[PDB]
Amino acid sequence: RSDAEPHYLPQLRKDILEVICKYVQIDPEMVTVQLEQKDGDISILELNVTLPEAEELK
Amino acid sequence: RSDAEPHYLPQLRKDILEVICKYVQIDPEMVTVQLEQKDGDISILELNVTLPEAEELK
Known part of the structure; x- marks a missing residue:
C-alpha cells in the first residue's frame, strides 16, 4: 500500500466515503x-x- | 452552482478538505x-x- 507511508491520506478519503454516507448512501x-x-x-x-x-x- | 441541488455533495468534498487539514495542511x-x-x-x-x-x- 503506497498510501500507507502517511497513514492519514487514506484516512481522509475513507472519511469522505462515510461523510457522503452520513448525508447520502x-x-x-x-x-x-x-x-x-x-x-x-x-x-x-x-x-x-x-x-x-x-x-x-426523502 | 449545479452542485447546490443536493446541498450535501459539496458539503462532503469541503469536509475532506478540512479532514486532510486535521491530519495535514x-x-x-x-x-x-x-x-x-x-x-x-x-x-x-x-x-x-x-x-x-x-x-x-513532525
Missing part, C-alpha cells in the same frame, strides 16, 4: 481513488465518487 | 473538484487533491 467500490505527483516534490490524490440513483430517501 | 485552491455522469441516471463526483511538500511538521 454509497458503497466504497463506487468511489475510485488514484494518487499522482508533479515534477516538484508535490502529490495529487484524486478520488472518483460514482453516486447511484436515489428517490426512496 | 493544504489549501482549497490545491484540491480540484469535477462531477461527471453515466448513461444510467448515475453521477461521478471526482476531486483532485494536490498536496504540497512537507517537512517542517
Whole structure:
C-alpha cells in the first residue's frame, strides 16, 4: 500500500466515503481513488465518487 | 452552482478538505473538484487533491 507511508491520506478519503454516507448512501467500490505527483516534490490524490440513483430517501 | 441541488455533495468534498487539514495542511485552491455522469441516471463526483511538500511538521 503506497498510501500507507502517511497513514492519514487514506484516512481522509475513507472519511469522505462515510461523510457522503452520513448525508447520502454509497458503497466504497463506487468511489475510485488514484494518487499522482508533479515534477516538484508535490502529490495529487484524486478520488472518483460514482453516486447511484436515489428517490426512496426523502 | 449545479452542485447546490443536493446541498450535501459539496458539503462532503469541503469536509475532506478540512479532514486532510486535521491530519495535514493544504489549501482549497490545491484540491480540484469535477462531477461527471453515466448513461444510467448515475453521477461521478471526482476531486483532485494536490498536496504540497512537507517537512517542517513532525
